[PDB]
Amino acid sequence: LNCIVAVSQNMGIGKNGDLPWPPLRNEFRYFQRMTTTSSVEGKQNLVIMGKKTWFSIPEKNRPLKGRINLVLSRELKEPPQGAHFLSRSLDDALKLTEQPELANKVDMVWIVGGSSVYKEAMNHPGHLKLFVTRIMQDFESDTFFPEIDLEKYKLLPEYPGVLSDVQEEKGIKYKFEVYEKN
Amino acid sequence: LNCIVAVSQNMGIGKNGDLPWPPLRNEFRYFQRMTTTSSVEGKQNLVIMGKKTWFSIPEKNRPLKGRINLVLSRELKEPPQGAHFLSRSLDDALKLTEQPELANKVDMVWIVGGSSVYKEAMNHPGHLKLFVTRIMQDFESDTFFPEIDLEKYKLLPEYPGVLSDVQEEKGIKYKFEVYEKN
Ligand SMILES: Nc1nc(=O)c2nc(CNc3ccc(C(=O)N[C@@H](CCC(=O)O)C(=O)O)cc3)cnc2[nH]1
Ligand SMILES: Nc1nc(=O)c2nc(CNc3ccc(C(=O)N[C@@H](CCC(=O)O)C(=O)O)cc3)cnc2[nH]1
C-alpha cells in the first residue's frame, strides 16, 4: 500500500475542492508516472480515492487511464460513471484485491485521497510508504494532510526513480519525498 | 439469473455429499454445456456454489473450466485453492457482479447449489429461470431441492438448446425442464 499526496507548506491539500495551488504540469506528470508505472510484467495498479476526489479529476481524465479506478463511498448507491469499482470502506476495498482473480491483475495499490482516506490508511497496520511532494510555499486551504508520525515512518533519502533536488515551476519550489513504515 | 440442478423423484440432490444416482455422462455434458456457453465472446459465465458443493467436485475438475468460480462461505477464512472469488452471501456475490469491471467480463450467472443457495436464489426477486433435470427414479438422499412455487414459476414447454424428449442412460430415464419467474 502506497499513498501519494502533494501538500503545501501548511499541510493543506484542498480548497473549495480544488488545488490550493496553480497547476504544476511536471508535478501532475510525476503523479501520472508513479501511479501508472507497474513493477510487474503485464499487471496494472489500482488507485483508490473517495468521492470528492473522483469528482476533482477533469471529466475528460476519468477514469484515470492505464489504472483500475476504485471509489470509496459509504453513500453512493452505484459507482460514478467511469469508475471500475465501488467499496463502502477502505477495508472492503483492500479485501477485494485479495480476491484471487483480482490479485493476479493488480500490482500496486495507491491511495490518492481525500483527507479522511489518507487518515484511515496512514493508521492501517502494515508496510506502507508515502510519496509526498512538499510544495514549499503557503497556500490557503480548508483540507489538510495528517501529521506524519516520525516514530513510525522514515524518510528514504534515496528512491529508485525519484529525483532528489528541488524542483521549481512558476516560481513554486517543491521536492519529492518518500517515507516508509513496516 | 439461472439455477440448474438435477433431482430425483423424491427431490434428492445429494447423499453423503455425493450424487445419489450413478453418473450420467450425457447429463453431465448438458450441465457443462449450459453453464459454459456464453452468448458473448470475450465474456464468461459466472458459477456460484456453496462450500460443500465446491468440495463435491472432483479436485481435478476444480475450478469448473471456462467459467468464473465463485464460492459462498460464511465461515471460510480465505478462498479454497482454485476458486476465483469468495463471498459471504449471495447478495454480496450478486453485488460483486454489478461492479463495472466485473460486469463486462461476465455474461450469465448460474447458481449450482447446495439446497441453501438454491432456496435463497429462488425467492430472490427479478427474472429467474430454473433448469431442472427430473431423474425419473427414487434415490436415497440426505439433501433435497426446495419445492418450486407454482404460484410463481411457470414451466416453459419449450426452450432453445433444451431437448424435449425423455432421455435414458444406464436404464435411468430423465427429462430436461425449464421454469421461469418474472
Ligand atoms: N503528487 C501528487 N500530485 C497531485 O496532483 C495529486 N492529486 C491527487 C488528487 N487529484 C487528482 C486530480 C486530477 C488528476 C489527473 O487529472 N490526473 C491525470 C492527468 C496527469 C497529467 O496530466 O500529468 C493522470 O493521468 O494522472 C489526478 C489527481 C492525489 N495525489 C496527488 N499527489
Ligand atoms: N443438471 C445438473 N446436473 C448436475 O450434475 C448438477 N451438479 C451440480 C453440483 N455438482 C457437480 C459435481 C461435479 C461437476 C463436474 O465435474 N462438472 C464438470 C464435468 C462435466 C462432464 O464431465 O461432462 C464440468 O466441466 O462441468 C459439476 C457439478 C449442480 N447442478 C447440477 N445440475
Tab-separated table of N, CA and C in Angstrom, chain B residues 14-164:
chain	number	residue	atom	x	y	z
B	14	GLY	N	-28.478	-35.031	-3.180
B	14	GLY	CA	-27.101	-35.364	-2.660
B	14	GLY	C	-27.238	-36.439	-1.581
B	15	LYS	N	-26.156	-37.122	-1.360
B	15	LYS	CA	-26.013	-38.193	-0.370
B	15	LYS	C	-24.556	-38.300	0.062
B	16	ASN	N	-24.394	-38.251	1.370
B	16	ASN	CA	-23.007	-38.358	1.941
B	16	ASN	C	-22.181	-37.436	1.021
B	17	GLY	N	-22.756	-36.315	0.755
B	17	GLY	CA	-22.172	-35.303	-0.101
B	17	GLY	C	-21.766	-35.810	-1.482
B	18	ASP	N	-22.438	-36.830	-1.984
B	18	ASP	CA	-22.220	-37.356	-3.328
B	18	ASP	C	-23.581	-37.304	-4.092
B	19	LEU	N	-23.515	-37.693	-5.356
B	19	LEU	CA	-24.673	-37.762	-6.226
B	19	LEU	C	-25.381	-39.092	-5.860
B	20	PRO	N	-26.673	-38.927	-5.709
B	20	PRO	CA	-27.485	-40.085	-5.274
B	20	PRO	C	-27.567	-41.167	-6.323
B	21	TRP	N	-27.450	-40.840	-7.599
B	21	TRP	CA	-27.533	-41.791	-8.722
B	21	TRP	C	-26.132	-42.009	-9.268
B	22	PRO	N	-25.985	-43.038	-10.087
B	22	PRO	CA	-24.658	-43.302	-10.748
B	22	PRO	C	-24.465	-42.132	-11.708
B	23	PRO	N	-23.271	-41.887	-12.168
B	23	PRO	CA	-23.006	-40.730	-13.057
B	23	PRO	C	-23.517	-40.936	-14.452
B	24	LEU	N	-24.260	-39.899	-14.880
B	24	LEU	CA	-24.851	-39.885	-16.230
B	24	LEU	C	-23.964	-38.960	-17.076
B	25	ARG	N	-23.192	-39.592	-17.949
B	25	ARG	CA	-22.291	-38.919	-18.858
B	25	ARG	C	-22.884	-37.746	-19.571
B	26	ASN	N	-23.956	-37.993	-20.269
B	26	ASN	CA	-24.696	-37.060	-21.086
B	26	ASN	C	-25.438	-36.059	-20.263
B	27	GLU	N	-25.756	-36.391	-18.989
B	27	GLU	CA	-26.477	-35.319	-18.212
B	27	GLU	C	-25.414	-34.331	-17.772
B	28	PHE	N	-24.203	-34.868	-17.546
B	28	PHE	CA	-23.041	-34.049	-17.110
B	28	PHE	C	-22.608	-33.090	-18.200
B	29	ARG	N	-22.628	-33.589	-19.406
B	29	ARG	CA	-22.339	-32.861	-20.661
B	29	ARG	C	-23.288	-31.636	-20.709
B	30	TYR	N	-24.577	-31.965	-20.605
B	30	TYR	CA	-25.576	-30.837	-20.594
B	30	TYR	C	-25.271	-29.810	-19.516
B	31	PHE	N	-25.032	-30.221	-18.278
B	31	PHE	CA	-24.728	-29.212	-17.180
B	31	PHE	C	-23.545	-28.386	-17.675
B	32	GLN	N	-22.548	-29.074	-18.225
B	32	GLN	CA	-21.320	-28.486	-18.705
B	32	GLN	C	-21.523	-27.449	-19.778
B	33	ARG	N	-22.322	-27.835	-20.751
B	33	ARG	CA	-22.702	-27.026	-21.916
B	33	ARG	C	-23.429	-25.793	-21.471
B	34	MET	N	-24.552	-25.920	-20.789
B	34	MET	CA	-25.349	-24.759	-20.369
B	34	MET	C	-24.583	-23.797	-19.473
B	35	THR	N	-23.755	-24.338	-18.544
B	35	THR	CA	-23.050	-23.451	-17.634
B	35	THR	C	-21.882	-22.785	-18.300
B	36	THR	N	-21.388	-23.448	-19.352
B	36	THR	CA	-20.253	-22.987	-20.069
B	36	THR	C	-20.510	-22.001	-21.211
B	37	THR	N	-21.548	-22.204	-21.960
B	37	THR	CA	-21.959	-21.373	-23.101
B	37	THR	C	-22.439	-19.974	-22.855
B	38	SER	N	-21.602	-19.043	-23.301
B	38	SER	CA	-21.796	-17.590	-23.197
B	38	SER	C	-22.318	-17.109	-24.552
B	39	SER	N	-23.254	-16.184	-24.502
B	39	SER	CA	-23.848	-15.573	-25.700
B	39	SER	C	-22.835	-14.571	-26.278
B	40	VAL	N	-22.000	-14.059	-25.394
B	40	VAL	CA	-20.994	-13.064	-25.806
B	40	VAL	C	-19.568	-13.543	-25.738
B	41	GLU	N	-18.891	-13.364	-26.863
B	41	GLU	CA	-17.465	-13.761	-26.932
B	41	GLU	C	-16.678	-12.693	-26.186
B	42	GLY	N	-15.755	-13.148	-25.365
B	42	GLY	CA	-14.883	-12.259	-24.570
B	42	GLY	C	-15.472	-12.096	-23.160
B	43	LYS	N	-16.564	-12.813	-22.946
B	43	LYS	CA	-17.295	-12.834	-21.678
B	43	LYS	C	-17.448	-14.262	-21.182
B	44	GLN	N	-17.349	-14.428	-19.852
B	44	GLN	CA	-17.562	-15.798	-19.343
B	44	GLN	C	-18.820	-15.771	-18.451
B	45	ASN	N	-19.316	-16.993	-18.296
B	45	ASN	CA	-20.481	-17.198	-17.346
B	45	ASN	C	-19.808	-17.335	-15.939
B	46	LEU	N	-20.507	-16.854	-14.920
B	46	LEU	CA	-20.095	-16.959	-13.514
B	46	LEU	C	-20.925	-18.065	-12.809
B	47	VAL	N	-20.262	-18.971	-12.147
B	47	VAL	CA	-20.946	-20.025	-11.417
B	47	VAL	C	-20.772	-19.766	-9.940
B	48	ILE	N	-21.897	-19.852	-9.237
B	48	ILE	CA	-21.890	-19.648	-7.779
B	48	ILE	C	-22.273	-20.912	-7.092
B	49	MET	N	-21.531	-21.247	-6.036
B	49	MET	CA	-21.927	-22.520	-5.284
B	49	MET	C	-21.477	-22.375	-3.857
B	50	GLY	N	-22.130	-23.173	-3.004
B	50	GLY	CA	-21.791	-23.158	-1.549
B	50	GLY	C	-20.537	-24.049	-1.424
B	51	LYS	N	-19.866	-23.927	-0.321
B	51	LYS	CA	-18.641	-24.647	0.021
B	51	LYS	C	-18.761	-26.143	-0.168
B	52	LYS	N	-19.793	-26.767	0.383
B	52	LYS	CA	-19.994	-28.198	0.269
B	52	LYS	C	-20.071	-28.642	-1.161
B	53	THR	N	-20.611	-27.774	-2.019
B	53	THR	CA	-20.725	-28.054	-3.450
B	53	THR	C	-19.341	-27.985	-4.140
B	54	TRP	N	-18.594	-26.988	-3.764
B	54	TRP	CA	-17.230	-26.835	-4.295
B	54	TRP	C	-16.476	-28.148	-4.121
B	55	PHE	N	-16.394	-28.584	-2.867
B	55	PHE	CA	-15.585	-29.726	-2.465
B	55	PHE	C	-16.165	-31.031	-2.977
B	56	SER	N	-17.363	-30.937	-3.471
B	56	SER	CA	-18.081	-32.106	-4.006
B	56	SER	C	-17.612	-32.412	-5.422
B	57	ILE	N	-16.906	-31.467	-6.018
B	57	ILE	CA	-16.446	-31.661	-7.394
B	57	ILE	C	-15.036	-32.263	-7.316
B	58	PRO	N	-14.860	-33.238	-8.173
B	58	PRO	CA	-13.553	-33.937	-8.204
B	58	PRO	C	-12.457	-32.918	-8.311
B	59	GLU	N	-11.543	-32.872	-7.371
B	59	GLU	CA	-10.408	-31.976	-7.301
B	59	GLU	C	-9.818	-31.677	-8.671
B	60	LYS	N	-9.972	-32.598	-9.581
B	60	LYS	CA	-9.435	-32.462	-10.938
B	60	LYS	C	-10.309	-31.590	-11.833
B	61	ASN	N	-11.551	-31.373	-11.454
B	61	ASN	CA	-12.485	-30.607	-12.253
B	61	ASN	C	-12.634	-29.230	-11.630
B	62	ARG	N	-11.858	-28.983	-10.600
B	62	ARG	CA	-11.961	-27.722	-9.866
B	62	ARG	C	-10.780	-26.818	-10.217
B	63	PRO	N	-11.056	-25.591	-10.605
B	63	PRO	CA	-12.376	-24.987	-10.751
B	63	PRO	C	-12.975	-25.392	-12.077
B	64	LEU	N	-14.271	-25.246	-12.173
B	64	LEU	CA	-15.017	-25.610	-13.403
B	64	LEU	C	-14.448	-24.698	-14.511
B	65	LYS	N	-13.888	-25.324	-15.496
B	65	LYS	CA	-13.217	-24.775	-16.648
B	65	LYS	C	-14.096	-23.934	-17.574
B	66	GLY	N	-13.536	-22.820	-17.984
B	66	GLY	CA	-14.194	-21.881	-18.912
B	66	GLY	C	-15.203	-21.064	-18.180
B	67	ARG	N	-15.171	-21.126	-16.828
B	67	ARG	CA	-16.186	-20.317	-16.058
B	67	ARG	C	-15.525	-19.652	-14.880
B	68	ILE	N	-16.144	-18.533	-14.440
B	68	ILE	CA	-15.501	-17.904	-13.204
B	68	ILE	C	-16.207	-18.677	-12.057
B	69	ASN	N	-15.427	-19.093	-11.095
B	69	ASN	CA	-15.921	-19.919	-9.946
B	69	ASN	C	-16.026	-19.053	-8.718
B	70	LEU	N	-17.257	-18.965	-8.184
B	70	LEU	CA	-17.447	-18.122	-7.013
B	70	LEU	C	-18.000	-19.032	-5.902
B	71	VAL	N	-17.269	-18.970	-4.788
B	71	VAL	CA	-17.627	-19.762	-3.608
B	71	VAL	C	-18.280	-18.857	-2.561
B	72	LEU	N	-19.361	-19.408	-2.024
B	72	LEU	CA	-20.099	-18.784	-0.919
B	72	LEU	C	-19.796	-19.506	0.426
B	73	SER	N	-19.230	-18.827	1.382
B	73	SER	CA	-18.968	-19.351	2.717
B	73	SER	C	-19.005	-18.260	3.817
B	74	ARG	N	-19.806	-18.531	4.827
B	74	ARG	CA	-19.935	-17.610	5.979
B	74	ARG	C	-18.630	-17.755	6.801
B	75	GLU	N	-18.230	-19.012	6.841
B	75	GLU	CA	-17.049	-19.443	7.593
B	75	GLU	C	-15.749	-18.960	6.976
B	76	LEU	N	-15.270	-19.824	6.100
B	76	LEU	CA	-14.066	-19.733	5.331
B	76	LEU	C	-13.350	-18.409	5.581
B	77	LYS	N	-12.080	-18.604	5.823
B	77	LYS	CA	-11.119	-17.503	6.065
B	77	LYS	C	-10.868	-16.896	4.670
B	78	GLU	N	-10.168	-17.696	3.870
B	78	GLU	CA	-9.889	-17.359	2.500
B	78	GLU	C	-10.506	-18.354	1.532
B	79	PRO	N	-10.411	-18.002	0.256
B	79	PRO	CA	-10.983	-18.848	-0.801
B	79	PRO	C	-10.163	-20.118	-0.976
B	80	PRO	N	-10.894	-21.217	-1.104
B	80	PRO	CA	-10.278	-22.514	-1.319
B	80	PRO	C	-9.332	-22.490	-2.510
B	81	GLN	N	-8.294	-23.328	-2.523
B	81	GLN	CA	-7.347	-23.395	-3.640
B	81	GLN	C	-8.168	-23.673	-4.905
B	82	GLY	N	-7.953	-22.805	-5.873
B	82	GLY	CA	-8.575	-22.816	-7.162
B	82	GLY	C	-9.739	-21.864	-7.352
B	83	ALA	N	-10.456	-21.427	-6.342
B	83	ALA	CA	-11.595	-20.512	-6.598
B	83	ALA	C	-11.127	-19.186	-7.140
B	84	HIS	N	-12.022	-18.508	-7.853
B	84	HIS	CA	-11.709	-17.165	-8.401
B	84	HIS	C	-12.119	-16.066	-7.419
B	85	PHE	N	-13.264	-16.233	-6.769
B	85	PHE	CA	-13.793	-15.271	-5.789
B	85	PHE	C	-14.374	-16.054	-4.607
B	86	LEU	N	-14.546	-15.378	-3.503
B	86	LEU	CA	-15.214	-15.896	-2.316
B	86	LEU	C	-16.114	-14.739	-1.821
B	87	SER	N	-17.327	-15.061	-1.484
B	87	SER	CA	-18.283	-14.168	-0.912
B	87	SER	C	-18.943	-14.854	0.337
B	88	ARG	N	-19.434	-13.921	1.151
B	88	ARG	CA	-20.111	-14.277	2.378
B	88	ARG	C	-21.553	-14.619	2.161
B	89	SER	N	-22.212	-13.937	1.251
B	89	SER	CA	-23.637	-14.182	0.961
B	89	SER	C	-23.869	-14.114	-0.545
B	90	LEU	N	-25.068	-14.551	-0.875
B	90	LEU	CA	-25.496	-14.496	-2.310
B	90	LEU	C	-25.617	-13.053	-2.728
B	91	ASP	N	-26.238	-12.263	-1.854
B	91	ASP	CA	-26.467	-10.816	-2.089
B	91	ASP	C	-25.157	-10.092	-2.332
B	92	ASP	N	-24.123	-10.452	-1.612
B	92	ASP	CA	-22.768	-9.943	-1.734
B	92	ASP	C	-22.132	-10.325	-3.061
B	93	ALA	N	-22.347	-11.577	-3.468
B	93	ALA	CA	-21.844	-12.070	-4.769
B	93	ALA	C	-22.567	-11.356	-5.931
B	94	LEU	N	-23.872	-11.238	-5.868
B	94	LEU	CA	-24.658	-10.515	-6.895
B	94	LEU	C	-24.109	-9.088	-6.930
B	95	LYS	N	-23.963	-8.500	-5.742
B	95	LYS	CA	-23.373	-7.119	-5.748
B	95	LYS	C	-22.001	-7.166	-6.423
B	96	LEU	N	-21.162	-8.176	-6.136
B	96	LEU	CA	-19.830	-8.197	-6.799
B	96	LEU	C	-19.941	-8.082	-8.297
B	97	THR	N	-21.013	-8.681	-8.758
B	97	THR	CA	-21.395	-8.845	-10.139
B	97	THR	C	-21.784	-7.605	-10.882
B	98	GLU	N	-22.214	-6.584	-10.222
B	98	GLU	CA	-22.657	-5.315	-10.817
B	98	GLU	C	-21.493	-4.304	-10.859
B	99	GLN	N	-20.374	-4.740	-10.303
B	99	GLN	CA	-19.161	-3.906	-10.300
B	99	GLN	C	-18.830	-3.912	-11.805
B	100	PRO	N	-18.629	-2.713	-12.277
B	100	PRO	CA	-18.391	-2.465	-13.684
B	100	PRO	C	-17.298	-3.275	-14.312
B	101	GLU	N	-16.209	-3.412	-13.614
B	101	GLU	CA	-15.032	-4.179	-14.136
B	101	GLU	C	-15.461	-5.636	-14.230
B	102	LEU	N	-16.351	-6.041	-13.334
B	102	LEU	CA	-16.807	-7.458	-13.353
B	102	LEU	C	-17.919	-7.626	-14.367
B	103	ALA	N	-18.783	-6.637	-14.395
B	103	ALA	CA	-19.945	-6.570	-15.274
B	103	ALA	C	-19.602	-6.821	-16.709
B	104	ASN	N	-18.456	-6.342	-17.142
B	104	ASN	CA	-18.076	-6.590	-18.549
B	104	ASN	C	-17.281	-7.821	-18.810
B	105	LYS	N	-17.134	-8.725	-17.859
B	105	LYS	CA	-16.366	-9.971	-18.072
B	105	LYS	C	-17.283	-11.204	-18.019
B	106	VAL	N	-18.442	-10.955	-17.441
B	106	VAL	CA	-19.431	-11.999	-17.149
B	106	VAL	C	-20.690	-11.771	-17.993
B	107	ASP	N	-21.130	-12.904	-18.491
B	107	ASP	CA	-22.358	-12.931	-19.312
B	107	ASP	C	-23.468	-13.445	-18.414
B	108	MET	N	-23.635	-14.738	-18.248
B	108	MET	CA	-24.757	-15.266	-17.428
B	108	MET	C	-24.275	-15.694	-16.047
B	109	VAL	N	-25.224	-15.667	-15.121
B	109	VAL	CA	-24.968	-16.130	-13.757
B	109	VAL	C	-25.714	-17.413	-13.487
B	110	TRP	N	-24.967	-18.480	-13.204
B	110	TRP	CA	-25.546	-19.776	-12.828
B	110	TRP	C	-25.300	-20.114	-11.349
B	111	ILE	N	-26.395	-20.522	-10.731
B	111	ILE	CA	-26.321	-20.950	-9.288
B	111	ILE	C	-26.318	-22.492	-9.295
B	112	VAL	N	-25.278	-23.111	-8.743
B	112	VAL	CA	-25.153	-24.544	-8.753
B	112	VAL	C	-25.457	-25.292	-7.496
B	113	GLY	N	-25.989	-24.650	-6.435
B	113	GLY	CA	-26.300	-25.363	-5.219
B	113	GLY	C	-25.382	-24.952	-4.101
B	114	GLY	N	-25.560	-25.502	-2.939
B	114	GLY	CA	-26.411	-26.517	-2.369
B	114	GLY	C	-27.819	-26.097	-2.090
B	115	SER	N	-28.649	-26.882	-1.453
B	115	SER	CA	-30.041	-26.543	-1.236
B	115	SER	C	-30.233	-25.210	-0.595
B	116	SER	N	-29.328	-24.801	0.238
B	116	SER	CA	-29.455	-23.472	0.866
B	116	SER	C	-29.377	-22.376	-0.210
B	117	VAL	N	-28.301	-22.444	-0.986
B	117	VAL	CA	-28.064	-21.419	-2.052
B	117	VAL	C	-29.312	-21.436	-2.964
B	118	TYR	N	-29.699	-22.591	-3.416
B	118	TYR	CA	-30.887	-22.695	-4.304
B	118	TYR	C	-32.096	-21.896	-3.812
B	119	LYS	N	-32.490	-22.158	-2.624
B	119	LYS	CA	-33.603	-21.627	-1.835
B	119	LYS	C	-33.640	-20.111	-1.772
B	120	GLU	N	-32.499	-19.583	-1.397
B	120	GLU	CA	-32.285	-18.151	-1.313
B	120	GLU	C	-32.410	-17.545	-2.702
B	121	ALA	N	-31.807	-18.273	-3.652
B	121	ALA	CA	-31.851	-17.763	-5.058
B	121	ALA	C	-33.251	-17.804	-5.617
B	122	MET	N	-34.036	-18.775	-5.209
B	122	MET	CA	-35.388	-18.969	-5.721
B	122	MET	C	-36.355	-17.850	-5.464
B	123	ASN	N	-36.281	-17.268	-4.281
B	123	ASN	CA	-37.170	-16.199	-3.880
B	123	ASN	C	-36.558	-14.853	-4.282
B	124	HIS	N	-35.289	-14.901	-4.581
B	124	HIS	CA	-34.651	-13.590	-4.961
B	124	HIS	C	-35.570	-12.999	-6.052
B	125	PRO	N	-35.855	-11.724	-5.936
B	125	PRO	CA	-36.739	-11.010	-6.835
B	125	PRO	C	-36.019	-10.797	-8.154
B	126	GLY	N	-36.827	-10.722	-9.189
B	126	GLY	CA	-36.352	-10.496	-10.557
B	126	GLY	C	-36.771	-11.639	-11.485
B	127	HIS	N	-36.171	-11.539	-12.666
B	127	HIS	CA	-36.303	-12.506	-13.738
B	127	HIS	C	-35.296	-13.663	-13.314
B	128	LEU	N	-35.847	-14.847	-13.236
B	128	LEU	CA	-35.234	-16.067	-12.884
B	128	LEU	C	-35.818	-17.251	-13.674
B	129	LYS	N	-34.877	-18.076	-14.096
B	129	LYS	CA	-35.183	-19.356	-14.751
B	129	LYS	C	-34.488	-20.495	-13.946
B	130	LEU	N	-35.179	-21.583	-13.859
B	130	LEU	CA	-34.778	-22.807	-13.266
B	130	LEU	C	-34.663	-23.884	-14.318
B	131	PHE	N	-33.445	-24.423	-14.404
B	131	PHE	CA	-33.158	-25.570	-15.334
B	131	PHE	C	-33.089	-26.824	-14.461
B	132	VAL	N	-34.181	-27.576	-14.482
B	132	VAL	CA	-34.348	-28.763	-13.705
B	132	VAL	C	-34.340	-30.060	-14.484
B	133	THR	N	-33.430	-30.954	-14.084
B	133	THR	CA	-33.423	-32.284	-14.769
B	133	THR	C	-34.180	-33.221	-13.800
B	134	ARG	N	-35.286	-33.797	-14.264
B	134	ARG	CA	-36.024	-34.719	-13.352
B	134	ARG	C	-35.545	-36.143	-13.644
B	135	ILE	N	-34.758	-36.698	-12.720
B	135	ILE	CA	-34.304	-38.134	-12.886
B	135	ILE	C	-35.537	-38.957	-12.439
B	136	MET	N	-36.085	-39.773	-13.318
B	136	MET	CA	-37.312	-40.493	-13.070
B	136	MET	C	-37.217	-41.724	-12.231
B	137	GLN	N	-36.548	-41.664	-11.117
B	137	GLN	CA	-36.413	-42.798	-10.156
B	137	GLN	C	-36.174	-42.187	-8.772
B	138	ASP	N	-36.447	-42.956	-7.765
B	138	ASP	CA	-36.257	-42.511	-6.358
B	138	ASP	C	-34.819	-42.933	-6.028
B	139	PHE	N	-34.151	-42.124	-5.247
B	139	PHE	CA	-32.770	-42.462	-4.831
B	139	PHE	C	-32.647	-41.978	-3.372
B	140	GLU	N	-31.966	-42.802	-2.596
B	140	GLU	CA	-31.743	-42.475	-1.185
B	140	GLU	C	-30.993	-41.174	-1.079
B	141	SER	N	-31.548	-40.207	-0.339
B	141	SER	CA	-30.820	-38.941	-0.246
B	141	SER	C	-31.001	-38.327	1.138
B	142	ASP	N	-30.092	-37.434	1.453
B	142	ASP	CA	-29.989	-36.678	2.659
B	142	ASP	C	-30.161	-35.189	2.414
B	143	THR	N	-29.882	-34.705	1.197
B	143	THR	CA	-30.098	-33.334	0.778
B	143	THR	C	-31.226	-33.237	-0.257
B	144	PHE	N	-31.994	-32.121	-0.204
B	144	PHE	CA	-33.183	-32.026	-1.063
B	144	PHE	C	-33.380	-30.649	-1.669
B	145	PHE	N	-33.913	-30.682	-2.892
B	145	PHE	CA	-34.126	-29.375	-3.606
B	145	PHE	C	-35.406	-28.823	-3.009
B	146	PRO	N	-35.417	-27.522	-2.736
B	146	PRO	CA	-36.627	-26.841	-2.221
B	146	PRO	C	-37.730	-27.063	-3.241
B	147	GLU	N	-38.969	-26.819	-2.891
B	147	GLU	CA	-40.070	-27.006	-3.897
B	147	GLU	C	-40.331	-25.687	-4.587
B	148	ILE	N	-40.675	-25.747	-5.847
B	148	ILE	CA	-40.979	-24.633	-6.742
B	148	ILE	C	-42.397	-24.086	-6.517
B	149	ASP	N	-42.466	-22.807	-6.241
B	149	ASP	CA	-43.753	-22.108	-6.036
B	149	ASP	C	-44.446	-22.013	-7.388
B	150	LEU	N	-45.440	-22.824	-7.548
B	150	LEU	CA	-46.204	-22.893	-8.811
B	150	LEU	C	-47.115	-21.690	-8.945
B	151	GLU	N	-47.131	-20.914	-7.891
B	151	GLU	CA	-47.926	-19.675	-7.793
B	151	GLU	C	-47.048	-18.563	-8.400
B	152	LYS	N	-45.783	-18.954	-8.536
B	152	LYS	CA	-44.753	-18.055	-9.027
B	152	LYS	C	-44.020	-18.494	-10.261
B	153	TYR	N	-43.685	-19.762	-10.381
B	153	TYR	CA	-42.922	-20.240	-11.542
B	153	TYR	C	-43.823	-20.827	-12.598
B	154	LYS	N	-43.381	-20.845	-13.849
B	154	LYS	CA	-44.223	-21.426	-14.931
B	154	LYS	C	-43.321	-22.335	-15.772
B	155	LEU	N	-43.768	-23.540	-16.001
B	155	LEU	CA	-42.966	-24.492	-16.818
B	155	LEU	C	-43.044	-23.977	-18.250
B	156	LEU	N	-41.931	-23.832	-18.916
B	156	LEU	CA	-41.947	-23.410	-20.343
B	156	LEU	C	-41.902	-24.752	-21.111
B	157	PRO	N	-42.907	-25.062	-21.881
B	157	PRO	CA	-42.962	-26.330	-22.643
B	157	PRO	C	-41.913	-26.430	-23.704
B	158	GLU	N	-41.083	-25.393	-23.818
B	158	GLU	CA	-40.009	-25.377	-24.788
B	158	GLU	C	-38.921	-24.390	-24.474
B	159	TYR	N	-37.735	-24.769	-25.018
B	159	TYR	CA	-36.586	-23.893	-24.791
B	159	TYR	C	-35.424	-24.260	-25.655
B	160	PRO	N	-34.932	-23.256	-26.357
B	160	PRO	CA	-33.769	-23.422	-27.242
B	160	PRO	C	-32.642	-24.092	-26.446
B	161	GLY	N	-31.999	-25.047	-27.101
B	161	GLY	CA	-30.873	-25.806	-26.558
B	161	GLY	C	-31.211	-26.947	-25.633
B	162	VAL	N	-32.468	-27.044	-25.250
B	162	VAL	CA	-33.010	-27.997	-24.318
B	162	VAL	C	-33.944	-28.971	-25.056
B	163	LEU	N	-33.420	-30.156	-25.200
B	163	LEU	CA	-34.069	-31.316	-25.848
B	163	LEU	C	-35.366	-31.599	-25.072
B	164	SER	N	-36.438	-31.795	-25.759
B	164	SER	CA	-37.767	-32.090	-25.250
B	164	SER	C	-38.013	-33.527	-24.893
